[PDB]
Design a binder for this molecule. Structure first.
Ligand SMILES: CCCCCCCCCCCCOS(=O)(=O)O
Length: 157
């Protein structure tokens, strides 16, 4: 479904701290519950020297905020990774300036969730504008965004 990818991505330059400032999904149920399946809060990206992507994140699971570590394997397209898990979910990098914001989507095989990542616990109105413009014609039915207080809490409580 997603046909916005970042050209010239240098995955090594996405390394480090990020915050999930906003999230949106195709289907309400993907983000609706607190333990909704795609309601995930990015902590750190750790690219490997081979160009795969180790992802640290938190998720609400079984009534608490759980730490996850997920591996997204590279493909022939630099902006597209495949999660080493049940149905091979695709991670697409739409857009990034490495130093402030990163937009990404995840999709299966037809469900979709996208996020606006930022480097700091601040509302970045220009990153959110780029996020909303990217989503404009994706078929999203739920959107969440977080305040700075929430961005500094586990699972954005
Ligand atoms: C370039 C940035 C890529 C951003 C990260 C992609 C996050 C993927 C999360 C999978 C969700 C399923 O999560 S699970 O822990 O319940 O299995």
């Amino acid at each position: 479904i997603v046909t916005q990818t970042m050209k010239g991505l240098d995955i090594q330059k996405v390394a480090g701290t990020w915050y999930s400032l906003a999230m949106a999904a195709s289907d309400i149920s993907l983000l609706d519950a607190q333990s909704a399946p795609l309601r995930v809060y990015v902590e750190e990206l750790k690219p490997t020297p081979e160009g795969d992507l180790e992802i640290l994140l938190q998720k609400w699971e079984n009534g608490e905020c759980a730490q996850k570590k997920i591996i997204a394997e590279k493909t022939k397209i630099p902006a597209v990774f495949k999660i080493d898990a049940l149905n091979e979910n695709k991670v697409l990098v739409l857009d990034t300036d490495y130093k402030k914001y990163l937009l990404f989507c995840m999709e299966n095989s037809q469900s979709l969730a996208c996020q606006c990542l930022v480097r700091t616990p601040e509302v970045d109105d220009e990153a959110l504008e780029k996020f909303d413009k990217a989503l404009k014609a994706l078929p999203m039915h739920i959107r969440l965004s977080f305040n700075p207080t929430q961005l500094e809490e586990q699972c954005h409580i």
